[PDB]
Design a protein around this motif. Sequence first.
Motif, PDB file in Angstrom:
ATOM      1  N   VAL A 170      -6.000  13.053  11.109  1.00 30.34           N
ATOM      2  CA  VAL A 170      -5.660  12.302   9.914  1.00 30.34           C
ATOM      3  C   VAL A 170      -5.191  13.269   8.824  1.00 30.34           C
ATOM      4  O   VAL A 170      -5.363  14.480   8.949  1.00 30.34           O
ATOM      5  N   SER A 171      -4.605  12.698   7.782  1.00 31.79           N
ATOM      6  CA  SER A 171      -4.109  13.494   6.673  1.00 31.79           C
ATOM      7  C   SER A 171      -4.146  12.674   5.382  1.00 31.79           C
ATOM      8  O   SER A 171      -4.228  11.447   5.423  1.00 31.79           O
ATOM      9  N   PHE A 172      -4.085  13.384   4.265  1.00 30.89           N
ATOM     10  CA  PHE A 172      -4.111  12.737   2.964  1.00 30.89           C
ATOM     11  C   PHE A 172      -3.091  11.598   2.899  1.00 30.89           C
ATOM     12  O   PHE A 172      -3.404  10.507   2.425  1.00 30.89           O
ATOM     13  N   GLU A 173      -1.892  11.890   3.381  1.00 29.61           N
ATOM     14  CA  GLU A 173      -0.825  10.904   3.384  1.00 29.61           C
ATOM     15  C   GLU A 173      -1.250   9.665   4.176  1.00 29.61           C
ATOM     16  O   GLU A 173      -1.391   8.581   3.610  1.00 29.61           O
ATOM     17  N   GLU A 174      -1.442   9.866   5.471  1.00 28.09           N
ATOM     18  CA  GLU A 174      -1.847   8.778   6.345  1.00 28.09           C
ATOM     19  C   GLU A 174      -3.168   8.174   5.864  1.00 28.09           C
ATOM     20  O   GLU A 174      -3.473   7.021   6.161  1.00 28.09           O
ATOM     21  N   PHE A 175      -3.918   8.983   5.129  1.00 33.64           N
ATOM     22  CA  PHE A 175      -5.199   8.543   4.604  1.00 33.64           C
ATOM     23  C   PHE A 175      -5.013   7.669   3.363  1.00 33.64           C
ATOM     24  O   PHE A 175      -5.680   6.646   3.213  1.00 33.64           O
ATOM     25  N   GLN A 176      -4.103   8.103   2.503  1.00 31.52           N
ATOM     26  CA  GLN A 176      -3.820   7.372   1.280  1.00 31.52           C
ATOM     27  C   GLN A 176      -3.645   5.882   1.580  1.00 31.52           C
ATOM     28  O   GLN A 176      -3.866   5.041   0.710  1.00 31.52           O
ATOM     29  N   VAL A 177      -3.253   5.601   2.813  1.00 34.91           N
ATOM     30  CA  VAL A 177      -3.048   4.226   3.239  1.00 34.91           C
ATOM     31  C   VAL A 177      -4.360   3.452   3.098  1.00 34.91           C
ATOM     32  O   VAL A 177      -4.351   2.262   2.789  1.00 34.91           O
ATOM     33  N   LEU A 178      -5.456   4.159   3.331  1.00 36.58           N
ATOM     34  CA  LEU A 178      -6.772   3.554   3.234  1.00 36.58           C
ATOM     35  C   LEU A 178      -7.189   3.481   1.763  1.00 36.58           C
ATOM     36  O   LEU A 178      -7.737   2.474   1.319  1.00 36.58           O
ATOM     37  N   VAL A 179      -6.913   4.563   1.050  1.00 40.99           N
ATOM     38  CA  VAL A 179      -7.252   4.634  -0.361  1.00 40.99           C
ATOM     39  C   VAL A 179      -6.619   3.450  -1.094  1.00 40.99           C
ATOM     40  O   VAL A 179      -7.295   2.747  -1.845  1.00 40.99           O
ATOM     41  N   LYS A 180      -5.329   3.265  -0.852  1.00 44.10           N
ATOM     42  CA  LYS A 180      -4.598   2.179  -1.480  1.00 44.10           C
ATOM     43  C   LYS A 180      -5.318   0.857  -1.201  1.00 44.10           C
ATOM     44  O   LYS A 180      -5.458   0.022  -2.094  1.00 44.10           O
ATOM     45  N   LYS A 181      -5.756   0.709   0.040  1.00 45.60           N
ATOM     46  CA  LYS A 181      -6.459  -0.496   0.447  1.00 45.60           C
ATOM     47  C   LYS A 181      -7.838  -0.526  -0.214  1.00 45.60           C
ATOM     48  O   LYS A 181      -8.404  -1.596  -0.431  1.00 45.60           O
ATOM     49  N   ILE A 182      -8.339   0.662  -0.517  1.00 46.54           N
ATOM     50  CA  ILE A 182      -9.642   0.787  -1.149  1.00 46.54           C
ATOM     51  C   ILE A 182      -9.528   0.389  -2.621  1.00 46.54           C
ATOM     52  O   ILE A 182     -10.323  -0.409  -3.116  1.00 46.54           O
ATOM     53  N   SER A 183      -8.535   0.964  -3.283  1.00 51.02           N
ATOM     54  CA  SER A 183      -8.308   0.680  -4.689  1.00 51.02           C
ATOM     55  C   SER A 183      -7.738  -0.731  -4.852  1.00 51.02           C
ATOM     56  O   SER A 183      -8.288  -1.544  -5.594  1.00 51.02           O
ATOM     57  N   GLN A 184      -6.644  -0.979  -4.147  1.00 47.16           N
ATOM     58  CA  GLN A 184      -5.995  -2.277  -4.205  1.00 47.16           C
ATOM     59  C   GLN A 184      -6.838  -3.325  -3.475  1.00 47.16           C
ATOM     60  O   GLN A 184      -7.994  -3.552  -3.828  1.00 47.16           O
TER      61      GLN A 184
END
Length: 75
Positions: free
Chosen positions: A61-75
Amino acid sequence: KSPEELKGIFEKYAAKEGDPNQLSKEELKLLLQTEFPSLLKGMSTLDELFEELDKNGDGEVSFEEFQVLVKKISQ
């Protein structure tokens, strides 16, 4: 809590395994453990996340591919 911490948090973990922009199952596990243990209970299991996030031919995994989760976390 804050974005700054979370950000650094991710790295603090990504630094452990692979580059600071690279995550690991065992790694994320911990994160998802403290960061958001609820996200684990979600319909997206560890493997699901690792696999979902890991959208390449290597296995990591990576920050980029991870950000996908973050976005879902925040959003």
